[PDB]
Amino acid sequence: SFVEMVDNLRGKSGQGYYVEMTVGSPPQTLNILVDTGSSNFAVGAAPHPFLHRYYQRQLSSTYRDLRKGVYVPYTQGKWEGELGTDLVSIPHGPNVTVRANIAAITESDKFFINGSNWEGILGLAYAEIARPDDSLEPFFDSLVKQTHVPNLFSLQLCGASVGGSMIIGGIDHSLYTGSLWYTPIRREWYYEVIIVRVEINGQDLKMDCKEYNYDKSIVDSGTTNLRLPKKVFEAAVKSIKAASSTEKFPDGFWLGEQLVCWQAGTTPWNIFPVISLYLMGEVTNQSFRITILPQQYLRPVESQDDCYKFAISQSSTGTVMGAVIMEGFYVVFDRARKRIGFAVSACHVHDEFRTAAVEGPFVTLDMEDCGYN
Numbered sequence: 001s002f003v004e005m006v007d008n009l010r011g012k013s014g015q016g017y018y019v020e021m022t023v024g025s026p027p028q029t030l031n032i033l034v035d036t037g038s039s040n041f042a043v044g045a046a047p048h049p050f051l052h053r054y055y056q057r058q059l060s061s062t063y064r065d066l067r068k069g070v071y072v073p074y075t076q077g078k079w080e081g082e083l084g085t086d087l088v089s090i091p092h093g094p095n096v097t098v099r100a101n102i103a104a105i106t107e108s109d110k111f112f113i114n115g116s117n118w119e120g121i122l123g124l125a126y127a128e129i130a131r132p133d134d135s136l137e138p139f140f141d142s143l144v145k146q147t148h149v150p151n152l153f154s155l156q157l158c159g160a161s162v163g164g165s166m167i168i169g170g171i172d173h174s175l176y177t178g179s180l181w182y183t184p185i186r187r188e189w190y191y192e193v194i195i196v197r198v199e200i201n202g203q204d205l206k207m208d209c210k211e212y213n214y215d216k217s218i219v220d221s222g223t224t225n226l227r228l229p230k231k232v233f234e235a236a237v238k239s240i241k242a243a244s245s246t247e248k249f250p251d252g253f254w255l256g257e258q259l260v261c262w263q264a265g266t267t268p269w270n271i272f273p274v275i276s277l278y279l280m281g282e283v284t285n286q287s288f289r290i291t292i293l294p295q296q297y298l299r300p301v302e303s304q305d306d307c308y309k310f311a312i313s314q315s316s317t318g319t320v321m322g323a324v325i326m327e328g329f330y331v332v333f334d335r336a337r338k339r340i341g342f343a344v345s346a347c348h349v350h351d352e353f354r355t356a357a358v359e360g361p362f363v364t365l366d367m368e369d370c371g372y373n
């Protein structure tokens with residue numbers, strides 16, 4: 001049942017959302033980070049200063065060695081591991097056990113976060129970008145193949161310790177208000193979408209829409225910030241900087257290096273603009289926009305003063321729709337129908353005068369005009 005899967009995600013702000021999983025026989029409990037931005041299921045398999053527990057292949061009778069080395073470089077951080085198969089379960093997910101590929105992390109650089117409470121990564125994206133090759137079946141692919149669990153999952157990430165829901169095998173209707181708006185998955189590698197228009201405070205950025213997706217645009221639960229290509233970032237910052245001319249900022253603030261503070265509860269939310277990302281619909285006249293408040297891109301950081309970090313950074317590998325974007329919304333990864341749905345989450349940040357929204361329809365440009373090749 002879907003009720004059993006509600007509130008099954010936990011985490012710490014800016015340290016990722018994780019799900020409880022068991023590996024091996026007898027089952028070993030491990031918290032695993034939910035990452036829609038990669039395709040490898042990997043778990044710490046050796047002692048680490050940041051790990052409280054790890055996967056022990058010697059203690060599992062159902063463990064099978066694949067005798068193959070694997071290495072995955074992320075945008076930030078990387079790990080090395082030995083490949084193998086074992087029985088995997090999700091206690092607060094569907095009541096099933098599956099044989100899946102597991103990368104036993106032996107060494108890593110800047111991957112694990114100190115006190116994050118997670119011990120591994122669940123790559124929910126497609127085989128095309130799995131390491132070392134697309135022949136290594138990702139976990140969700142293994143789950144669908146072995147069971148009757150529908151080829152669909154949905155993420156409801158809630159902001160300010162953080163909680164959330166990963167509904168495996170369908171959609172939970174109590175976790176969203178209004179309508180679900182779907183955007184096509186352009187290619188089955190990352191969860192690649194197409195951004196067709198960007199509006200800041202109702203003003204069009206007036207950029208070639210191919211720039212918004214320069215290289216690509218991806219939906220990534222394993223990235224905190226909203227990330228934009230160099231050119232788009234430059235224009236976006238120029239808009240937010242000009243909208244908030246009343247307050248003075250340090251130079252490092254816009255680069256995610258410095259924090260800005262105000263008096264307790266005297267945060268000037270009003271002068272910070274809303275950002276509208278328009279996502280191409282399955283039909284071009286059925287496109288829609290997701291609007292995010294300053295409360296989403298100005299992340300709270302730990303003095304009675306309220307301090308905030310600018311949670312928009314530039315990218316070299318295209319747009320990344322991180323937690324910042326996802327946190328206000330119920331995001332449905334409809335793999336079966338090659339599309340991603342957006343709806344207003346039940347756990348949204350409540351602004352007095354403004355509201356985060358998924359609104360449509362809109363007429364926009366299509367894949368020919370906005371897609372990069």
Ligand SMILES: CCCN(CCC)C(=O)c1cccc(C(=O)N[C@@H](Cc2ccccc2)[C@@H](N)C[C@@H](C)C(=O)Nc2ccc(F)cc2)c1
Pocket residue numbers: 014015016017033035037038039072073074075076077110111112113121129130131220221222223224225
């Ligand atoms: C959420 C925790 C807080 N952090 C980490 C702490 C600063 C962030 O918000 C953060 C900030 C910047 C970058 C990344 C980042 O690289 N995240 C990784 C996931 C991950 C999660 C936790 C620890 C480190 C990495 C992906 N989600 C990124 C994708 C694009 C990618 O590399 N795919 C990819 C790469 C190779 C491949 F063969 C196929 C696919 C994450």
